[PDB]
Scaffold this active site. Structure first.
Site, short mmCIF file in Angstrom:
data_model
loop_
_atom_site.label_atom_id
_atom_site.label_comp_id
_atom_site.label_asym_id
_atom_site.label_seq_id
_atom_site.Cartn_x
_atom_site.Cartn_y
_atom_site.Cartn_z
N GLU A 141 0.87 -1.16 0.00
CA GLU A 141 0.00 0.00 0.00
C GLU A 141 0.91 1.22 0.00
OE1 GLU A 141 -2.02 0.74 3.78
OE2 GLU A 141 -3.88 1.17 2.68
N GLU A 156 -8.06 10.51 3.48
CA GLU A 156 -8.10 9.53 4.55
C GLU A 156 -8.33 10.25 5.87
OE1 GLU A 156 -6.30 5.36 6.09
OE2 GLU A 156 -5.06 6.49 4.68
#
Ligand SMILES: O[C@@H]1[C@@H](O)[C@H](O[C@@H]2CO[C@@H](O)[C@H](O)[C@H]2O)OC[C@H]1O
Length: 244
Positions: free
Chosen positions: A122, A224
């Protein structure tokens, strides 16, 4: 149909249960886990709880609105695959204080052993942030891309959600030396960050496949939030400006 939608369909993106559909105009995403296309723009949207909504149009304008609470959400628009030579352009318009405003994506090599955390990665190229990930990772190097200094970090996620289900995987990070301003166009020259990670031996596994169990190896401009202590919104527009 828009070309990326046609390409994704012809390569079997519908194999993923979480892939919703192509929306021709604009849609609001609020469910726990979804991917799809709005116009030519891929999107991802994932949270472990709480309430957060992604509003996305066919021109790549988007907004993420989040509710205060103890949860993690990450989502935004872009591409169903990472391309190491992509130049991502964006302008960010408003930011209540997201944890990250960041390029966000995954690589995955099904042929590598899962005991190697580099089998699935990621990755993040931060642009704005209220949480500093340096505390969670090891430093790699500092480099200059598009005239600004970025520093790299590698962290590990142990038995955590991923595009391949619960997995132990590395995260690769690139963080600039200053917050990137709202209201002005910015560029992320992805190749420079790929190169900087590789310069310390952090190789990205394949970024152009549907081999994982849950999601494509996508790449988006994401908002996020981690345990937001207030409601908030963040909005901007993303595009591809890769020299072609
Ligand atoms: O596409 C989804 C991913 O976005 C999700 O990855 C988590 C997102 O929050 C990050 O902080 C975490 O490190 C990561 O585990 O995993 C599920 C996947 O479907």
């Amino acid at each position: 149909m828009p070309p990326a939608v046609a390409d994704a369909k012809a390569s079997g993106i519908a194999r993923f249960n979480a892939y919703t559909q192509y929306f021709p105009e604009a849609t609001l995403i609020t469910q726990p886990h979804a991917t799809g296309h709005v116009g030519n723009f891929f999107f991802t949207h994932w949270k472990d709880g709480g309430s957060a909504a992604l509003d996305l149009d066919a021109k790549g304008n988007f907004s993420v609105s989040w509710q205060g609470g103890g949860y993690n959400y990450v989502g935004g628009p872009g591409w169903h695959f990472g391309d190491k030579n992509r130049v991502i352009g964006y302008r960010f318009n408003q930011d209540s204080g997201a944890s990250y405003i960041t390029l966000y994506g995954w690589g995955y090599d099904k042929s590598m052993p899962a005991t190697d955390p580099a089998h699935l990665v990621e990755y993040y190229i931060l642009q704005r942030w209220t949480y500093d990930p340096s505390q969670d990772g090891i430093y790699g190097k500092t480099f200059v891309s598009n005239g600004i200094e970025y520093s790299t970090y590698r962290s590990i996620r142990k038995v955590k959600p991923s595009i391949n289900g619960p997995t132990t995987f590395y995260q690769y990070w690139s963080k600039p030396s200053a917050q990137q301003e709202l209201g002005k166009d910015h560029k992320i020259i992805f190749a420079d960050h790929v190169k900087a990670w590789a310069d310390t031996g952090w190789i990205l596994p394949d970024m152009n496949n549907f081999d994982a169990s849950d999601d494509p190896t996508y790449q988006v401009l994401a908002v996020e939030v981690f345990n937001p202590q207030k409601n908030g919104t963040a909005s901007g527009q993303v595009w591809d400006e890769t020299p072609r």
